[PDB]
């Protein structure tokens, strides 16, 4: 799996994150940071929206005469005129935050696409379905290294080399 | 920092359910995690489950898989906790409590609720 | 993940020094088992951040520090309050599992 080919059911610890599996065990995990900033970035929309309303205390109803047509039908334009303006802000605003939501959300994951494989480097195949594989082997240490972004290149140069090397022809 | 207020005890009979509110003041509700946890009479705390308001994710512990519902509403600023199927095994302080952040613990308790189940 | 944080119960007189520990099968996380103190009849008060930042509020004489599945907090200068139950959360770990809880006694 990965995100090119959907999302996954049983990763509950957060929006985005990880599953990786090697020769100690297997299963998923969130990339805590990436999805609190996530979360923090969607709560602060959300927020934004509705605090900005203005709420007063108001009065809204208001009483006419037989001969006050005008002033009714007046009152009546003012909110219409205010309803339709609100509702289609409303609309057209949460159907463009809707959008801009689902694209943020899918060029975060591609984002942790780009941290690994910029972490990485050559040491590890991309797949394209959202993988990666090491060519050394990776431990438990290593897979948590690269969660954290800490992972020690140099450290694996070598063996990565006489993996990827496995294939190399002449030498 | 945000408070946080409980239903008041409850007694049901087993087989029954029980559902425990949580409401928010003081502060932002959307902006804290709401975190369930259970404290067994003479023992330790147990987690049950948390919820974001804003991202969902609700998070279950095993035991409880498939009976508990942990919701939110940011519209009324509250929290339930709605536990099916109620066992003797259930009596328990069910304590709601806020977090600042979805993966930091919470220091916002609130003030507990009994829930006894018995005959 | 399984998490034994109370191995003993503990006495001591107040003013002492004393430490408590809370070992675990698996790493929690990075630096992220929280330590809590709950007074009977109390809801749980948060001592420690992770694994070792002190809580907005609390006092100078708790501290700690640990990694991996061993981690320990220390109380200096211990007084009447601090004699009720301590226990550990693995926040930052999939289910988040809380200790035994532990007892500190008055000599």
């Known amino acids: 799996a990965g995100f090119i080919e959907g999302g996954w059911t049983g990763m509950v610890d957060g929006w985005y994150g990880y599953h990786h599996q090697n020769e100690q065990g297997s299963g998923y995990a969130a990339d805590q940071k990436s999805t609190q900033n996530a979360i923090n970035g969607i709560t602060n929309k959300v927020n934004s929206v509705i605090e900005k309303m203005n709420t007063q205390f108001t009065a809204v109803g208001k009483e006419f005469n037989k001969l006050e047509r005008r002033m009714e039908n007046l009152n009546k334009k003012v909110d219409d005129g205010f309803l339709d303006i609100w509702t289609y802000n409303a609309e057209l605003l949460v159907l463009l935050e809707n959008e801009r939501t689902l694209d943020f959300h899918d060029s975060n994951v591609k984002n942790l696409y780009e941290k690994v494989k910029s972490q990485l480097k050559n040491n590890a195949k991309e797949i394209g379905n959202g993988c990666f594989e090491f060519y050394h082997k990776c431990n438990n240490e290593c897979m948590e290294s690269v969660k954290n972004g800490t992972y020690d290149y140099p450290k694996y140069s070598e063996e990565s080399k006489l993996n990827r090397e496995k294939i190399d022809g002449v030498k | 920092q945000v408070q946080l207020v409980q239903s008041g005890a409850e007694v049901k009979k087993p087989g029954s359910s029980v559902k425990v509110s949580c409401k928010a003041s003081?502060?932002?509700?959307?902006?804290?995690?709401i975190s369930w946890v259970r404290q067994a009479p003479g023992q330790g705390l147990e987690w049950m489950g948390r919820?974001?308001?804003?991202?969902?994710?609700?998070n279950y512990a095993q035991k409880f898989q498939g009976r508990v519902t942990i919701t939110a509403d940011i519209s009324t600023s509250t929290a339930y906790m709605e536990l099916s199927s109620l066992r003797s095994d259930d009596t328990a302080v069910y304590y709601c409590?806020?977090?600042?952040?979805?993966?930091?613990?919470?220091?916002?308790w609130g003030q507990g609720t009994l829930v006894t189940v018995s005959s | 993940i399984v998490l034994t944080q109370a191995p003993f119960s503990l006495s001591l007189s107040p003013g002492e020094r004393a430490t408590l520990s809370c070992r675990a099968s698996?790493?929690?996380?990075?630096?992220?088992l929280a330590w809590y103190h709950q007074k009977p009849g109390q809801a749980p008060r948060l001592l420690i951040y992770?694994?070792?930042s002190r809580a907005t509020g609390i006092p100078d004489r708790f501290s700690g520090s640990g990694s991996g599945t061993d981690f320990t907090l220390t109380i200096s200068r211990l007084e009447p309050e601090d004699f009720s139950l301590y226990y550990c959360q693995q926040y930052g770990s999939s289910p988040l599992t809380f200790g035994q809880g532990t007892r500190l006694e008055i000599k």
């Open positions: 409590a806020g977090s600042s952040g979805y993966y930091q613990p919470p220091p916002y």
């Open positions: 003081g502060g932002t509700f959307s902006r804290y995690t």
């Open positions: 698996q790493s929690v996380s990075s630096s992220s």
């Open positions: 919820i974001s308001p804003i991202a969902g994710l609700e």
């Open positions: 992770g694994a070792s």
